[PDB]
Design a protein around this ligand. Structure first.
Ligand code: NAG
Ligand code: UG6
Ligand code: CA
Ligand code: CA
Ligand code: CU1
Length: 277
């Protein structure tokens, strides 16, 4: 049931942080946000779920139409380790000779913001807003680094799929996965969400800004205009040493037509969509 959703309860939470770790990203100021009750996908959208959508609609993703997408060099641009690879896309995540046949339950990758909106709308859903996403990530805890608390490895256990070792030379796979993990891997957070931090980055519906006010808001949607859309949660590539973005308060951005080997999504909805019998 990798398309199942969980009810996210109505509430008020502190979005952002007054102790930002990447100040340039507008993690600050902390602000009180009220969110109405809604539903969030328990899992990142998987390759199998995305294939159902493509089978139904014939949808060609933007990476397939452009002919290329960004791949991390270690698995074969914003950084030397990001390469535009011809023929890399959701069915071929590291280029034309790679395949998804052995990883049907891993998160779909190389999906743009437009691809994600197409999928979620086809499913009777939508992308979450940044505030909905962050509220859900926090899993009912207040002002914590991670969905589960402040310790990276609570009780000596790995709680998310990120990088271990010296990036980018060595990824030890200590957490069990060098690349992606199945969408149902690792513990759920307090709302029942899996891999909300780590694994694949996750698109949200908001336009990106770094300028936020301390005023209290209700179901905020982000700025009315922009050039980049917000992504959240970090990925299997993140490490404290260079990309400390597997925190709920963290945030990044990309143009809506862009795609990469560490970027996926999950859907949300005001109410349960029609039962998929
Ligand atoms: C998509 O269609 C192909 C061809 O009919 C089929 O083999 C495959 O199992 C389908 N995928 C899903 C997820 O239903
Ligand atoms: C995310 O990619 C990796 O961890 C790869 C897998 S072969 N290893 C290196 C050293 O980059
Ligand atoms: Ca890992
Ligand atoms: Ca994720
Ligand atoms: Cu990161």
């Amino acid at each position: 049931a990798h398309s199942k959703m969980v009810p996210i309860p109505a509430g008020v939470f502190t979005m952002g942080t007054d102790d930002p770790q990447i100040k340039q990203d507008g993690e600050a100021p902390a602000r009180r946000v009220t969110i109405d009750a809604f539903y969030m996908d328990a899992y990142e959208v998987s390759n199998t779920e995305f294939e159902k959508f493509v089978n139904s609609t014939g949808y060609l993703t933007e990476a397939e139409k452009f002919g290329d997408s960004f791949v991390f060099e270690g698995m074969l641009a914003a950084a030397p380790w990001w390469l535009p690879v011809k023929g890399a896309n959701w069915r071929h995540p590291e280029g034309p000779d790679s395949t998804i046949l052995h990883r049907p339950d891993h998160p779909v990758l190389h999906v743009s913001w437009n691809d994600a909106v197409a999928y979620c709308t086809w499913a009777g859903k939508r992308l979450p807003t940044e505030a909905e996403w962050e509220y859900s990530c926090r899993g009912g805890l207040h002002n914590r680094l991670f969905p589960w608390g402040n310790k990276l490895q609570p009780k000596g256990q790995h709680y998310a799929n990120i990088w271990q070792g010296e990036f980018p030379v060595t990824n030890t796979g200590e957490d069990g996965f060098q690349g992606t993990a199945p969408v149902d891997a690792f513990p759920p957070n307090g709302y029942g969400l899996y891999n909300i931090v780590g694994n694949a980055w996750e698109w949200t519906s908001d336009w990106w800004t770094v300028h936020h006010s301390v005023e209290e808001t209700l179901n905020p949607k982000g700025p009315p205009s922009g050039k980049d859309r917000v992504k959240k949660g970090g990925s299997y590539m993140c490490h404290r040493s260079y990309c400390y973005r597997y925190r709920c308060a963290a945030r990044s951005q990309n143009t809506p037509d862009s795609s990469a080997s560490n970027l996926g999504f999950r859907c949300a909805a005001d109410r349960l969509p029609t039962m998929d019998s």
